[PDB]
Amino acid sequence: DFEPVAIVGISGRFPGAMDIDEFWKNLEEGKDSITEVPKDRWDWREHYGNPDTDVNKTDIKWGGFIDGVAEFDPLFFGISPREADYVDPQQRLLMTYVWKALEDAGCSPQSLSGTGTGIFIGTGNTGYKDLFHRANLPIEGHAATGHMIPSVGPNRMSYFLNIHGPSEPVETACSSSLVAIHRAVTAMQNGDCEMAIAGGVNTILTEEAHISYSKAGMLSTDGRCKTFSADANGYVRGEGVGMVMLKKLEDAERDGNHIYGVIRGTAENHGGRANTLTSPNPKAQADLLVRAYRQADIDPSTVTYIEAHGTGTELGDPIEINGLKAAFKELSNMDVPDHRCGIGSVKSNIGHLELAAGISGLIKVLLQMKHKTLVKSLHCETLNPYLQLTDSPFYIVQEKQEWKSVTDRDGNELPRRAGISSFGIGGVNAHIVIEEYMPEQPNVIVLSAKNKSRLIDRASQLLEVIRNKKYTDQDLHRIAYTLQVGREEMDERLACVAGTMQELEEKLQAFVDGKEETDEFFRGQSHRNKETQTIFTADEDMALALDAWIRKRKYAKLADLWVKGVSIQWNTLYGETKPRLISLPSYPFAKDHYWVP
């Protein structure tokens, strides 16, 4: 009954990592991105002290922090600069990264308008409203949808995108963004929606939670998640945002999406009565895993990596290992002899992103699949003696290594299979099972943006990515098609004709360098040529001429019309078999500052 769900687009920003590319670079190099708290959030020295004896003090001076928490492009999203000050950074990052995941997928907003697409995002209050009260700012009407009601974040994006599926904040603490994946997939099975965006956003805006969580005994006095280590003594807090776009696998394959991985099963439960309210329950976790792998109907011996919840608490890590061991044993009781499974945790790299913890874990795994590499889990040179992995399928990933394929009883290599766990301190558990996805002539390369500065930015992004050779000449039509049908058509336009990445690169540089134009690329503004658009759209004879130009591949001519805002049916440029959509740079939003006024 369960229909597999494709992951067709992703986006994110993490401690030390501006985007998904840098994130992988950091993970591959074993980089630790935890820092001391930045002065622009609060002064850690001012609140420093012994949390067990000193009023409102903490010894926790560390966190994983992201750049740009206050950056937003409100006009892009139809919000005024004045309104923007009132809008919670939780919402602003939500809107920004949802759009980026859509652009990553190559899914145009026009394609999404009117659909039952769902949105499920781990989000909640993180102190923006408190920053208002501290500055003794008056209470205004804007505050209500701006920063008083967390559901407004997802709801504002559904409004903007004109989509009709469920639109919800998800808050189950540490497990939120993985429960959101569960809820999204579940929604896709029962017809609540057809496609969904899911993810999480976590921001650390005041010292209050550091202080309170410090006093509750949750945080490491060394400021590191030393997951699996004998020295594990709490977690370190982090900020971040991650988003995935989800489509039924059938649809994704049919529509030509690119596919990061396939969700084969999910589960959510609660730990029930544990030792204390905040103690994880190894029996609940085992049962969770069992449910997920039964749904996926995959053999436990083919699962070769697990992204643990792995917060680096002294008691939690072994409990998690014990849950895994019980689960795999029960599943074995009811394919690949010598079962070996790596275990690691992105928390060791960027800390515990709380609301965005689960999505950060899924993205690490997707990248690990893309690059057939298991990256190093940090700070665990000396393993916690309670793990006892020797007589089991499991090992901790203590060094970067190839993620090797496994092969069935017959001769054929199997897709890499992995699981991701996320557990909330209140007892809400989630697990997700992922499987690796197993798959001249000129064209018109088009770009558009809201204004000239953003258009130059888009050009640079594309330029930079061609130069660091992420693409080759075999990709050119995939690039062209994605840009043609997989991007919103905005007002400021650039088009050039190219048959090679080199020819493309050259024309892009020309537009970027200057100026520097001599009729080699095309430029226009949609709003400045109306009545020509009407002519080519509401007149049957001009439409037929336009169709002929496309069929005859008059590229230079079509480019000239497109930059002027004339609607071109690019599909007619291709046979029945369309080029597969491809991951390209997403919108370079203005980095404008909005904060408490």
Added chain:
Amino acid sequence: DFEPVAIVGISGRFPGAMDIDEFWKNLEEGKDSITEVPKDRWDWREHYGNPDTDVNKTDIKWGGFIDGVAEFDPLFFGISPREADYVDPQQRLLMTYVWKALEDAGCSPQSLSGTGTGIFIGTGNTGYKDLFHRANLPIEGHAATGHMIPSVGPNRMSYFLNIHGPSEPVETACSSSLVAIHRAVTAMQNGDCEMAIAGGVNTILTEEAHISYSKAGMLSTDGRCKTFSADANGYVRGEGVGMVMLKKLEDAERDGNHIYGVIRGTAENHGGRANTLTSPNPKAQADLLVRAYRQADIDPSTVTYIEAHGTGTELGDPIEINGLKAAFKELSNMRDHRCGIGSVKSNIGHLELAAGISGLIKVLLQMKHKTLVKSLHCETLNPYLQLTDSPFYIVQEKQEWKSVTDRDGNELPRRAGISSFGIGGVNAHIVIEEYMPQPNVIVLSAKNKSRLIDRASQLLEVIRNKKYTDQDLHRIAYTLQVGREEMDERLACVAGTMQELEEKLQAFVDGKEFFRGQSHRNKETQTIFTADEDMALALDAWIRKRKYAKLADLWVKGVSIQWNTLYGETKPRLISLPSYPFAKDHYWVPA
């Protein structure tokens, strides 16, 4: 493919209404429960002014408020009095009312332990943390799970009850508690759980939202939801809490549950791009409804009441009517209908997180009593409703809720719908159908003597106001025997009529023919009587010989009696009885 879900237990507290009984009394009488803001919340005069011109001021001095917002019995839930101060009233009310909904159903905690039961509750921050942040109270470790993370409310109850199903806060603004029902019903269909508890909790603890929402243009300057009226000009804020226990209809019938009504379909959607972010979308509401009723596979002409979202906005009320008309028209097309419409907000205000659950409970009671109650303040209808050429009329006066009959001459179960729409655009709709169906030992227990006396008075009072007959006696007995946790302070009496029961209860309450004991003080007797096969035979013989006074005597001393064996294969049906009378101790922000 859709499996119908039974509502088998309910609980709640609303403005002007301490419990469900009083809530119905208020509704039947057409009572308006909105008042001025109580001084113990804030002083409205202090924040009074013109919201359009005056900084930090509002002209909104009304709300629907409940009693006991600060009241909690923490030792019941294994929480210390000291920790209790840090626990958000959102969570305290959640725990309190989830337990009452379980007891209403006649479901013992022992029965739930280890099960995959879910909890889905509309809840969120409502200012408790802000009351700390103001009085510059020190930040403590207790604050983290106490009032910083709203998911801890449902999670703490899953912990307490030892249940393993999904446990979640639901926050979609105004639609939250109805979306919670959708999510629970959906979870029960896909195996995320077997049974579920769903509901909503809304508390109004500071003036901040009154001020912001006032300035946003959301609130009536008269302080009333005048839903459907020509004077409709915004809503009035209310507090409240309501809970339902949900079981698959198959299971409920099989297990002998009593059933308030049956959910035949649900739906949730988003309005997408509307005129503004906060504008409702009649086309989205129409598609919502169409989906719910298609799922329910019921003919539209059999639906005879709709509980509208009905906030009493000038533009929203007609928009809702237009969505309804379009939906039913579309439903007729893919195949003398008369359908009433009302809104409980006219009675108690907009309960926000608990608005949806309030509307459902009104409908359940309307069903119980075969009555459509008056929707208030709508003597003069909004001229934009345009109801004349349609099945709909506004319920402007109390009236019988009449059955309608099919073509084969047969009576139909009453069918109703409930809508709840969030200001961010999240819509939910739920379709409900009316459910069509010698002595014993009466036992009571509580955590202490005071709570036991409370339980006895509750039972006395409900017998005196004639809620039961002699025909119910074995249902009462059975429910109390198997549908209540066995707590330490115990009372039992033998009775063959309500009269005799009433007499014996009055005797115990007065201070005076009944049995009384404490389980923890009779480990000696428990030793004598426990874990032996010949003792078992003896107990089986006492039951067979109906030696009730003797069994009652042992039971109050903490001996296990197999009460099930007093009955044949078909047990009496569980019945709704008063739920635990929690201690009304005050817990709040610490000095």
